[PDB]
Amino acid sequence: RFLKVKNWETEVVLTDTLHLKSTLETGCTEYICMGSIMHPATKDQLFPLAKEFIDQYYSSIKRFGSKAHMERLEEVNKEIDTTSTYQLKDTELIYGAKHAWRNASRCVGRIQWSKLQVFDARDCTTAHGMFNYICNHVKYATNKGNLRSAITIFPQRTDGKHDFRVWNSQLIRYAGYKQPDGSTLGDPANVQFTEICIQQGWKPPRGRFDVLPLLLQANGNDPELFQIPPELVLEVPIRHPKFEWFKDLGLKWYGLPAVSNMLLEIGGLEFSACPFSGWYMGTEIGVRDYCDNSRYNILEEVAKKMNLDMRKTSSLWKDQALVEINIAVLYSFQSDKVTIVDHHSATESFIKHMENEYRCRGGCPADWVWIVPPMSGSITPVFHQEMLNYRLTPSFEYQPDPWNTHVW
Amino acid sequence: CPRFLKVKNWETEVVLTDTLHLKSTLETGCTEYICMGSIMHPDVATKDQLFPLAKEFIDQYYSSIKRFGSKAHMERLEEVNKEIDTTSTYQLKDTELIYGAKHAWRNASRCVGRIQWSKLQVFDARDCTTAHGMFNYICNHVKYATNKGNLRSAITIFPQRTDGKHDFRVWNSQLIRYAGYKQPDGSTLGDPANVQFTEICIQQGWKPPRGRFDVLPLLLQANGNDPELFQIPPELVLEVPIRHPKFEWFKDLGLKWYGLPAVSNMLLEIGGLEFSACPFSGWYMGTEIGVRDYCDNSRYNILEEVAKKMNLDMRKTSSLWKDQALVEINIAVLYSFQSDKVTIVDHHSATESFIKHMENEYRCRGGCPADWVWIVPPMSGSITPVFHQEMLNYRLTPSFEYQPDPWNTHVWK
Ligand code: HEM
Ligand code: HEM
Ligand SMILES: CN(C)Cc1cccc(NCc2ccc3ccc(N)nc3c2)c1
Ligand SMILES: CN(C)Cc1cccc(NCc2ccc3ccc(N)nc3c2)c1
Ligand SMILES: C[C@H](O)[C@H](O)[C@H]1CNc2nc(N)[nH]c(=O)c2N1
Ligand SMILES: C[C@H](O)[C@H](O)[C@H]1CNc2nc(N)[nH]c(=O)c2N1
Ligand SMILES: [Zn+2]
């Protein structure tokens, strides 16, 4: 049935037909909603998925049922038959990668979806090769501050014993170190991964913002360490436009968010290594990275320097400090001509995107829990926007951390 | 359905195990292929529909008082069954009514204040027959709940639905709210949320003062009759003028708000019985006033004026002038209620208490249904502990439910 979503602020009603195309499961049932749970082949399984995907590709270029379409299905069937898998055409690789982004219900940045530079790395065979492809990606995407969205796609899974994996959760991240006195220097989120690099031979500077090395696994082999050339790593010193003391906090961050631990699924094929990157929404750094208790956790320090009353929660000293940090982040990136978007501009673009997608596509799967920013929720337009969440393919999926499945 | 569902807290690593979901009674709207978790709102019971619903509830009650399977349990079951057979409905005992109301609150997935669920004063108004009587009961409720600023949670329960043509309804969405007035020029005076209701009151004969904060009259329907207007005695309406501990100019904005949040348009369902008029009240979380009531664009919408008084650059969104003003307004709200000794809770305290409540519930009850979309506060989400807390949402009974607005269904006499 057609489903309607209302925006309670504008009263705009949109009608969703697209959800009828979903075949994957969401996690919820008729009796239990799991909307806030973070994470809820064979030849025989493979062809219908391949077919589903070839069909929507040829439907998308408006040549559904053409001789080209009929021949492609044939070629794929034969290939699955004779090899237990198949290879995508370049055009298909690009189409599928753009559509995995378009379908990512949790991403507020999807107005950009069709502007994605796709780097085909399916000829890669070694960790050195992966490193080369990754450097090129970082250089292209960074573009001296004028960030460009990109994805690099490594060879698809075969038997599962020969996966290509980027072990890093993002290409560029800061180390975290467990201290004898039990505290944590650097980023506490990366403590484990940092330990694995150390155990593997990495000589740690033991600073607060040490860029981690790349740990790269090719064809199921043991992962290998590489240092990203520093000239490729663009960073922004965080300062505040009014508090001249803010720079004295010694804060910085990297300009390029490049998630590298997801799995890209296209037409039944699985790409376990597909680092992709866009640009930051300010809150990702200013709210979560800096102010999560289990992350850099700087609220106290900033609040101190602001000389706030931190004796009672109801003084909202945390909220005040939170806003000023986010002002600083946006100001710093903007002053250094590095692409960044604030949560007001971003959510506004997402609403427009939604309207675009309902109009041309019959809907837009969206995960309110993720779309709504981690501060000032209800003063952004998405807070008041009803969303429907459903899973469309091609997609980006979670996968297990490689140190839990890998034998050495 | 799997027997054990686990929820994780991503900042503390605490994992909890839910079994209570097995007691889920109604559908959420989600299916295996779509989630409707951000959808706001996704003819009487027959004899045969009522029997198992009553038995389900009676069993649950007797289990709660450790008298399950007792002679008193079996006798109550038999007496209820007889009543349904010979009258096609039944009446709850006072003990059952009280247990039912507390549990509807305990089960309200969207409520962050549920640590308090067992301290609810229940006023039984099932003897009420007229709108003047409803007025008396509501006045008493307001006075008791207000308690000179030391607010006490309470519910007043009017007679249950019979044939559906004799419903008791409070037409107001909350017992105390401010009027809204649409102007010929398109502007709105007062609270734009309440324009429709205000118009209805004016048509019913209410003479509007036409101010910015006019307390709306009660519009009360008894026994399916046409609703009637009553003015709440103003001494019963506790209000707090909003000022700011630093900004001396904040008081010159002339804002105030009422101390008692008393939702009055919901339906209470107990054992298949339907109480269409069951006004209940607790106390405010500051953000309900400082974020939603004041800063929603479709509400009082004061961010701009505050921002201007704060001398902020309002030319770029990326200056975060809105966020900056929003915090100051919420500081003013908490400061003003605390100064006037009217109970209020800030969003940090409330969410931390809720996490403790939820953990206790998982341990003593086997779960705690929770709607993350509603539980996470409308500002500063991720610096409260509920943001990182996985939740499971499902519907248990007794429960509070939405019902249509009565002016849309009322057959005028
Ligand atoms: C171009 C600028 C972009 C912006 C501003 C943006 C913004 C965001 C934000 C703020 C989130 C929430 C992340 C979090 O809170 O941890 C997110 C999620 C996500 N984004 Fe985007 N994004 C962008 C580009 C991209 C690109 C290029 C891709 C892939 C080709 C992508 C795919 C995803 C996916 C799959 C998620 C969900 C991840 C998960 O489920 O854990 N995004 N995005
Ligand atoms: C005593 C202190 C209380 C606090 C701090 C509190 C807090 C809240 C808050 C902040 C919300 C979301 C409000 C919104 O954004 O509109 C809510 C919703 C709700 N509350 Fe509580 N509440 C309290 C008492 C009560 C009581 C006494 C009842 C019933 C007996 C109750 C039942 C509900 C229900 C049913 C909802 C969902 C409303 C809806 O779905 O529209 N609460 N509560
Ligand atoms: C844990 N892994 C999924 C990697 C990881 C680490 C930390 C945060 C996230 N967030 C997911 C995510 C995915 C894509 C993004 C694209 C752009 C952007 N600015 N943030 C994005 C964020 C993802
Ligand atoms: C729509 N109706 C349920 C009435 C209505 C009007 C305006 C706001 C709300 N919010 C829901 C709601 C329900 C119960 C509450 C109890 C206490 C409190 N502080 N807020 C509460 C808020 C509810
Ligand atoms: C679209 C969305 O469901 C709607 O804006 C909800 C979001 N969460 C909410 N949460 C609370 N507490 N109160 C609300 O009114 C809402 N509104
Ligand atoms: C429990 C909850 O699902 C979890 O904390 C989610 C909440 N919403 C989020 N939203 C975004 N954008 N990013 C996140 O990491 C999370 N975390
Ligand atoms: Zn759901």
8 Å CB contact between A241 and A223: no
H helix or E strand, kind and range, residue A258:
strand A258-259
CB atoms within 10 A of CB B302: 20
Q: Quick one: which of A167, A271, A166, A221 has its CA closest to A407?
A: A221
B324 known member of a binding site: no
Cβ-in-10-Å burial (0-12, 13-18, 19+) of B213 comes to middle
Q: Which residue matches tokens 């305290």?
A: B349
Q: Interhelix angle for A43-60 vs A67-83, to 10°?
A: 160
Residue type, A238: I
Domain B239-261+284-349: CATH superfamily, name plus number: Nitric Oxide Synthase; Chain A, domain 3 (3.90.1230.10)
Residues with CB under 5 A from ligand 7 (ion): A 28, 33, 35; B 30, 35, 37
- The nearest CA of chain B is from the CA of A388 a distance in Å of 6
* CA A112 – CA A131 distance, rounded (Å): 27
Which residue in the set B303, B383, B390 is minimally distant from A318, CB to CB? B383
Q: Is B38 annotated as a binding residue?
A: yes
> Could you tell me which chain A residue has the CA closest to the CA of B392?
A34
Which atom belonging to ligand 2 lies closest to the Cα atom of B101? 30
Q: How far apart are CA A6 and CA A219, in angstroms?
A: 48
With a 6 Å cutoff on the Cβ, whether B265 touches ligand 4 is yes
**Cα A21 off chain centre by:** 24
Distance B222 CA to ligand 5 centre (A): 31
The enclosing H or E element of B5 equals strand B5-8
CATH 3.90.340.10 segments of chain A: 16-122+149-159+263-277+347-371
| Among candidate residues B376, B351, B379, the one with its CA nearest the CA of residue A322 | B379
Residue whose CA is at the smallest distance from ligand 2 atom 36: B111
Q: Which atom of ligand 4 is nearest to the CA of B283?
A: 19
How far is the alpha carbon of B261 from chain A, nearest alpha carbon, in Å?
Answer: 19
Neighbours of A293 (CB within 10 A): 14
Topology at the third CATH level for domain A235-257+280-345: 3.90.1230
By CB neighbour count within 10 A (0-12 exposed, 13-18 middle, 19+ buried), where does B81 fall?
Answer: middle
The single-letter DSSP state of residue B284 is E
Angstrom distance (rounded) from CA B11 to CA B383: 11
CATH level 3 topology of B127-152+167-238+402-406: Nitric Oxide Synthase;Heme Domain; Chain A, domain 2 (3.90.440)
- State which fold the A16-122+149-159+263-277+347-371 domain adopts: Nitric Oxide Synthase; Chain A, domain 1 (3.90.340)
Atom of ligand 4 nearest to the CA of B284: 19
Sign of torsion over alpha carbons A51, A57, A63, A67? negative
Give the max Cα distance, chain B.
74
- Torsional sign, CA B143, B149, B154, B160: positive
Which residue's CA is minimally distant from atom 14 of ligand 1?
Answer: A284
Does ligand 5 come within 6 angstroms of the Cβ of A369?
A: no
Strands A269-271 and A263-266: antiparallel
Q: State the maximum Cα–Cα separation within chain A, in Å, rounded to a whole number.
A: 74
Residue A263 backbone dihedrals phi, psi, to 5 degrees: -110, 125
Per DSSP, the three-state class of B382 is helix
Residues A281, A287, A289, A294: is their CA dihedral positive or negative?
Answer: negative
Whose tokens are 């971003």? That residue is: A346
How many Å lie between the alpha carbon of B110 and the closest alpha carbon of chain A?
13
Tokens representing B235 are 């001494």
3-state secondary structure of A23: coil
Residue with tokens 């740690």: A204
Look-up: residue for tokens 């969205």? Answer: A149
CATH architecture of A123-148+163-234+398-402: Alpha-Beta Complex (3.90)
Resolution in A: 2.0
Q: Tokens 């006033």 belong to which residue?
A: B289
Residue A388 tokens, joined: 């429907």
Q: What CATH number was assigned to the domain covering residues B18-126+153-163+267-281+351-375?
A: 3.90.340.10
* Residue from B263, B371, B368 nearest B41 by CA: B371
**In this structure, are residues A292 and B11 in contact, taking their beta carbons and an 8 Å threshold?**
yes
CA of residue B97 to ligand 2 center, whole Å = 20
Q: What are the residue ranges of CATH 3.90.440.10 in chain B?
A: 127-152+167-238+402-406
B13 annotated binding-site participant: no
Spell out where chain A is interrupted, by the residue before each break (C to N > 2.5 A): 40
Query: Which residues are within 8 A (CB) of B341 and not within 5 positions of it... i.e. 6 or more apart?
Result: B149, B150
- Tell me whether residues A389 and B37 touch, CB distance under 8 A: yes
Alpha-carbon gap, residue B386 to A260, rounded angstroms = 28
Q: How far is CA A305 from the centre of its chain?
A: 34
Q: CA B272 to CA B92: how far, in whole Å?
A: 11
PDB experimental method: X-ray
Give the residue among B28, B10, B223, B2 at the shortest CA–CA distance from B109.
B28
How far is CA A82 from each of CA A73, B19, B382, rounded to the nearest angstrom?
Answer: 14, 48, 51
Cross-strand bridge partners of residue B281: B154, B262
Compute the half-sphere exposure of residue B299: CA atoms within 13 Å on the CB side of its CA: 17
Residues 6+ apart with CB under 8 A from A99: A394
Where are the domain boundaries for CATH 3.90.440.10 in chain A? 123-148+163-234+398-402
